[model samples]
Target chain A: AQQERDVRELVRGVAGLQDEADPNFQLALNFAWSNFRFHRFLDVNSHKIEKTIEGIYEKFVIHSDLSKAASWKRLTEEFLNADAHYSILSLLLCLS
Target chain B: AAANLNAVRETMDVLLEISRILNTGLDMETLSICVRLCEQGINPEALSSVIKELRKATEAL
Candidate 1:
C-alpha cells in the first residue's frame, strides 16, 4: 500500500508539477491515472493480459508524439525481454 | 516466452491500426492523450474508456 502511494506521488510530482501546462501535461495526467489503476491487476490475471496490452499499444502508444512513441516501444520491448528492475526503471524514466 | 510472443504479435496488429487512424482526420488533442496513456503504462481498459469518452465528446460537436 505504501509503495502504491509512493508511485502515485512520483507520478503526480512529475505529471502535475509542470508549469505552463499544455496538451502534453494533460496526456501525462491521464497516463498517470491509467498506470496507477492498472498496476493493481498486473500479475493476477493472464487470460486477458495480452489483449489489454494490445489495446493499450493501439490507443496510447500508437497515437503519441512520434519520438515518445518510439521510445515507448523500445522500452516495452526491453521490459518484455527481461522484466528486470533495470528495464522497469528505464520505462519509468520515459514516462516521467 | 510464448506469452511474450503473443503480446508482440498483438502489439503489431495494434500498430497497423494506429497507421490507419493517423491517415484519417481525428482531433489531434485527443490523439495525443491516447499516446501518453500508453507511454505512462496505463492499463488497457481504462485507456480505452477514457478515449471512448473523448471520442464521444468529439462526435457530439
Candidate 2:
C-alpha cells in the first residue's frame, strides 16, 4: 500500500504538465504505471520489463505531439530507472 | 454465457474509448484478461475498478 502510494506520487511529480487537470494525461500516466505494477507483481525480470516499457515509449512517442516528446521520453526514462521499485515488488511477491 | 458475452461487448466499448484517448493501440492480452475475468463472473464494479486503475497507471508525458 505504501509502495503504491509512493509510486503514484513519484509519477505525479515526474509527469509535469500544464494541463494537470487533463483527464487524458492522467489516463495515460495511470495505464503505464499500472502495466509496470502488473508486470512487477508477476515477478517479471528487468529485461522483460524494459521491453514492455519500450513498447509504451514508442507508441506514446509516435502518437503524441512533437512538443510533448521530451516529457514523454522523460516519463519513460523514469520508469526504466525504477529498479528499486521493482525490487521491492519482487520481495513482496515472494512473500506472498 | 450470454450475459458474459454482453459484458465483454460493453467492456470492449470502454476499451475502445480508452484506445481513442491514448491515440494508440492496446495490448490484446490485456483485453483477453478483461474478457476472461468477466466470463468468470467478475463483478462489473471490480472490472470498472480495473479500468479506472489502468487509467490511473498510464499517465503519459
Candidate 3:
C-alpha cells in the first residue's frame, strides 16, 4: 500500500534529476541490475523505477561497508521488493 | 562478546601453528611454504597482510 511512499522516499534520497544521464547512473544501474539479477529477476524495464532505485542506491551506498558485502545484500533486497510498488514483480530469485 | 571470544580463540590457534613451525628452526623458505599452505581456506587479504608484516620482520632479523 505504501509502495509509492517507499518508492518516492527511496528515489528522492538517491536520484539526481539534474544529471539524469550521468555515468554514475550506470554504475548505480549496474549495481541495481546485478542485485536484481542475483535475486532472479531477468530484466528491469521501468525507467522511472530503475532511475529512482539507482538514485537511492548511489545515495545510500557510501554509508555501507563494501568489505562486509552489505552492498550486495541491500541490492538484493531492493530487487526482491521491486514489485511492491507496481504490480510488476518478476519471478526472479524466488524464495531462496 | 561470544563471537569475539570465538574469533580470538581462533586467532590463538593461528598463533600456535606459527609457533610450532618456528620452534623447529624452520628455514625462511620452508616457513614461507608452510605459511602459504596454512593460508588456505582463510581470508587471503588477511593472510597477505600477515605475510607483509612477517617479511619486514624477517628482513630485520
DockQ of each model against the real complex? 0.06, 0.03, 0.01
Q: Pick the DockQ winner.
A: 1
Please give, for residues B1-61, the per-residue lDDT of candidate 1 as tens digits: 6798887556544433442333322233333333344445554344444334443443353
TM-score of structure candidate 2: 0.27
In the range A41-87, model 1's lDDT, one tens digit per residue, is 34223334445444545666657666656654554554444212222
Please identify which of the two predictions, 1 or 3, would achieve the higher lDDT against the true structure.
1
Worst 10 residues of 1 chain A by lDDT: A83-92
Which of the two candidates, 1 or 2, achieves a greater TM-score against the reference?
A: 1
- Which residue pairs show backbone clashes in model 1? A60-B34
lDDT per model vs. reference: 0.42, 0.43, 0.34
Give the Å shift of residue B26 in candidate 2: 20
CA error at residue A39 for candidate 3, angstroms:
32
True contacts kept of 2: 0.00
Off by over 4 Å in 2: A1-42, A79-83, A87-96, B1-61
- Ignoring the other chain, what TM-score does chain B have in each prediction? 0.41, 0.44, 0.37
Docking class of 2: incorrect
**Local error of candidate 2 at residue B37 (angstroms):** 24
lDDT of 3 at A75: 38
TM-score of chain A of each: 0.32, 0.35, 0.26
